[PDB]
Amino acid sequence: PAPEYRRVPFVKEDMEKVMEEVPEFKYYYVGKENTKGNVYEGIPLDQSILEPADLRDYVPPHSNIQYSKLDNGLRIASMDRGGLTASLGLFVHAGTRFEDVTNFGVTHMIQNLAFASTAHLSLLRTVKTIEVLGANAGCVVGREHLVYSAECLRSHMPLLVPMLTGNVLFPRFLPWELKACKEKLIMARKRLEHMPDQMVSELLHTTAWHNNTLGHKLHCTERSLGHYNPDVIRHYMLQHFSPENMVFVGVNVNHDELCTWLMRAFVDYNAIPPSKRTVASPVYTGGDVRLETPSPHAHMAIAFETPGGWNGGDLVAYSVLQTILGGGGMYTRLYLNVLNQNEWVESAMAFNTQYTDSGIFGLYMLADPTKSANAVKVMAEQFGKMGSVTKEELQRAKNSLKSSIFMNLECRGIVMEDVGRQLLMSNRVISPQEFCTAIDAVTEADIKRVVDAMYKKPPTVVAYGDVSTVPHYEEVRAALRAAGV
Amino acid sequence: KLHCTERSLGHYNPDVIRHYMLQHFSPENMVFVGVNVNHDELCTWLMRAFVDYNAIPPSKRTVASPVYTGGDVRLETPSPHAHMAIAFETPGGW
Predict the structure, then answer these.
(1) DSSP secondary-structure letter at A456?
(2) CA distance to partner chain A, nearest, from residue B75 (Å)
């Protein structure tokens, strides 16, 4: 069931009366009107200075999500917890899985151009104002989403909504800004050369879905710097950045003010018109890849596909199984049956990554580079016996996962991005009580029912570092075959 | 590989070089060839080179058969062509 959005109609108003609702803002301080100075000078900090006028009788705010929609299509969601700082975020359904042979790299360019010159503000003025308000702001690319966000005191929200929406309503893309911003496209990967874990992540993705959708790289290659001209950026944006592909989310703001100041942003201008885009299903290839470098471990990872991804019904099964095995505790399956029984492994882990319509699940390990052939055997055994579980471990895992669920959402930024991401993915937010009710229902049998389906396509195999002893492709797949995988 | 990788610059100390040479550079693993020279002078001046000194002593080394794996690999770069190659093994070689 989707939420029942409340309508927000467009209305046109006298600017000289709307200017009485704008927050006060100063950039110069030509003298100062107040001469009284530090009125609490010489008072120790264990001696109060509050007057009885500044006492209150506490009334909580109400913190269930409020859902609204503008007439042009934009969806708005808000919460308040009575904190003093607010979190604001704009979510666009424009990831890299939507590019093609003529587009590769365009999303990175757009992100690298966030908060650049727009119709009514320059780049310098924008960023300097964001600095002087005291805020922190930024933009993030993924494989399915693009996100802009900002954060400071809640009384500054009216000044931040423009600067966030600007980027999607009317950027200019002057050539001399594109040209000056180019080197940041290369540094993004130059830093990955000293982050082995993330590197292995990217290898897994490009090996699992070879040359399509989720397989695409998250960065601009050398071949991607040709089509770095404004027309390609603009033509790409015209296909994705329409309002009905967006969500705006706010935490610690009053919802009617948020609705008002968002409506007042789109009322004068024509937004990008809608488009009935279609999306192709990922094709999972699997395969094998190696990359050698002087690292003192053999880094290895093996993975299998999750059919259906986030829209598959078994989203809870994998997330419980990951905690049976051992996530990124000391009574977990891997900790007991690998790390405490072998001297030459530094770390073993289970990983689980999901997207709207496909995912992957697997194991990751660091080992002594002289014993990679034993590392493969250990991994093959482990995969061998994921099919079967005992109720002690299962209960341990279900309780642990419930605890983690509840305790992870005690933080406003995580909540904001969670709500956004869920609304983009399926137009519904799953409240934690529902997550717990779903976790409680997972059976012992369903684990086997899921794994038997997981092993029906070829594996994805990655090695990194001192790989000098890793068996050959056929040897790895035969080791997995012997262990019944 | 025909080159030194980064991992290959550790063991760049004289003892490893010398110990490797002691296993291969003995005379019975060598040939000396000359074109446009008079053979008796060549023999004479080669004999006069080894007469004073002890050469590296022989070793009965053994060599393992190559194992052919085959497989597949790709490497992207801005070149304006798709370069492709496919190959199969010659059993026994020369």
Answers:
(1) T
(2) 12
- Find the helix packing angle between A157-169 and A255-266, rounded to 10°: 40
Resolution in A: 2.8
> Left, alpha or beta for A220 (phi > 0: left; psi -120 to 50: alpha)?
beta
Task: Name chain B contacts of A222, Cβ cutoff 8 Å.
Answer: 77-78
Beta bridge partners of residue A67, listed in sequence order: A77
Tokens of A335: 């900790």
Amino acid at A339: L
- Provide the experimental method for this PDB entry: cryo-EM
- Residue A238 tokens read as 């015209």
Exposure of A248 by Cβ count < 10 A (0-12 exposed, 13-18 middle, 19+ buried)? buried
Structure tokens at A381: 């055994």
DSSP B19-53: HHHTTT-SGGG-----SSS-HHHHHHHHHHHHSSS
Nearest to A113 by CA among A148, A161, A160, A143: A148
Tokens in use for A348? 């073993």
> Shortest CB distance from A473 goes to which of B6, B7, B71?
B71
Cα of first residue to Cα of last residue in chain B, in angstroms, is 21
**Which position has the token pair 């404004």?**
A230
Q: How far apart are CA A75 and CA A4, in angstroms?
A: 11
Amino acid at A41: E
- Kindly report the backbone phi and psi dihedral angles of residue A180, in degrees, each rounded to the nearest multiple of 5, phi listed first: -75, -25
Residue of chain A whose alpha carbon sits nearest to that of B78: A223
Best interface-test mutation with A: which of B1, B8, B69 has the largest number of A CBs within 10 A? B69
Longest CA–CA separation in chain B, Å: 60
Distance CA A311, CA B69 (A): 40
Give me the amino acid identity at A154. Answer: R
> In the structure encoding, which two tokens stand for residue A278, read together?
């279609």
A79 forms beta bridges with A251
Interface of A to B at Cβ within 8 Å reads: 221-223, 292-294, 466, 468, 472-474
Residues of B with CB under 8 A from a CB of A: 5-7, 69, 71, 76-78
Q: Which residues of B2-34 are buried (b: 16+ CB within 10 A; e: fewer)?
A: eeeeeeeeeeeeeeeeeeeeeeeeeeeeeeeee
Q: Could you tell me if A401 and A352 are in contact, meaning their C-beta atoms sit under 8 angstroms apart?
A: no
Tokens linked to A393: 């471990």
Pairing of the two strands A75-79 and A66-70: antiparallel
Taking the C-alpha atoms of residue A394 and residue A396, their distance in angstroms, rounded to an integer, is: 5
